[PDB]
């Protein structure tokens, strides 16, 4: 007999918690509630590690149905996909080595900055130094690190769970995490659709019934040992 067939879900595997890899699979934050909110909307799927650009390009050309990426909702963004309810509340945050003179985004002025391309840790360097040579841009954030931790660049910009993690795991490396309250703005995450999806209505009740059930949170303290603040994802 005929037929799957499986909602296509993208995502980019090199953002340590939400998604990564690990022995050959793709683990993490997303990946795990991904897995719950399928389950809670009666939804065979498939989860693939496209990567970042490709995510968003195959979302436009609905190749992939959907995407969980630790992707921040925002207006432009639903100019041209549709989003979840939220799930998560973050902030961009700065990256530097221990002894870095940094103490906020501010100081980052004249200083080379790195990046992912096409992030919410772009648009802010972007938006507090304007566009230029310094603002240095990556296709995965592992290679940001990477171009901080080897002297490329002065700074990195991005997400507090992702730069947090990566401190709390690398001791070795030395690193420090700014968090700069005044100069970067709070961000929630959503799970992305082409615009126009038929899978967005189902994936919302699911999500809601995910969080009702405890399941949710389970998921963050396996994740972040600590209780989240439900009251964040109503506001
Ligand atoms: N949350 C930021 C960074 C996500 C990058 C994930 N690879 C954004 O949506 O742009």
């Known amino acids: 007999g005929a037929t799957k067939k499986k909602v296509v879900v993208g995502t980019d595997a090199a953002f340590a918690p939400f998604e990564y890899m690990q022995k050959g699979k793709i683990v993490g934050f997303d990946v795990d509630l991904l ?4 389950k809670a909307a009666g939804l065979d799927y498939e989860l693939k590690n496209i990567g970042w650009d490709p995510l968003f390009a195959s979302l436009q050309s609905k190749e992939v149905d959907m995407g969980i990426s630790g992707i921040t909702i925002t207006d432009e963004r639903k100019q041209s996909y549709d989003f979840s309810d939220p799930y998560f509340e973050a902030t961009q945050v700065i990256l530097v080595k221990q002894g870095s003179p940094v103490k906020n985004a501010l100081d980052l002025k004249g200083k080379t900055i790195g990046v992912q391309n096409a992030t919410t840790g772009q648009e802010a360097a972007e938006k507090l130094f304007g566009k230029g040579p310094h603002i240095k841009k990556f296709e995965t954030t592992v290679v940001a690190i990477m171009e ?8 990195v910009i991005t997400d507090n ?6 401190v709390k795991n690398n001791p070795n490396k030395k690193l420090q995490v700014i968090e700069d309250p005044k100069n970067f703005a709070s961000e929630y995450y959503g ?11 189902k994936v919302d009740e699911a999500l809601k019934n995910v969080i009702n059930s405890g399941k949710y949170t389970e998921i963050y303290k396996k994740w972040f040992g600590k209780e989240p603040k439900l009251d964040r994802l109503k506001q």
Not at 161 to 166: D, F, I, L
């Open 148 to 155: 901080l931790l080897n002297g490329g660049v002065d700074a």
């Open 161 to 166: 769970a992702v730069a947090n993690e990566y």
């Open 35 to 38: 897995d719950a909110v399928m």
């Open 191 to 201: 799970m992305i659709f082409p615009k126009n999806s038929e899978l967005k209505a």
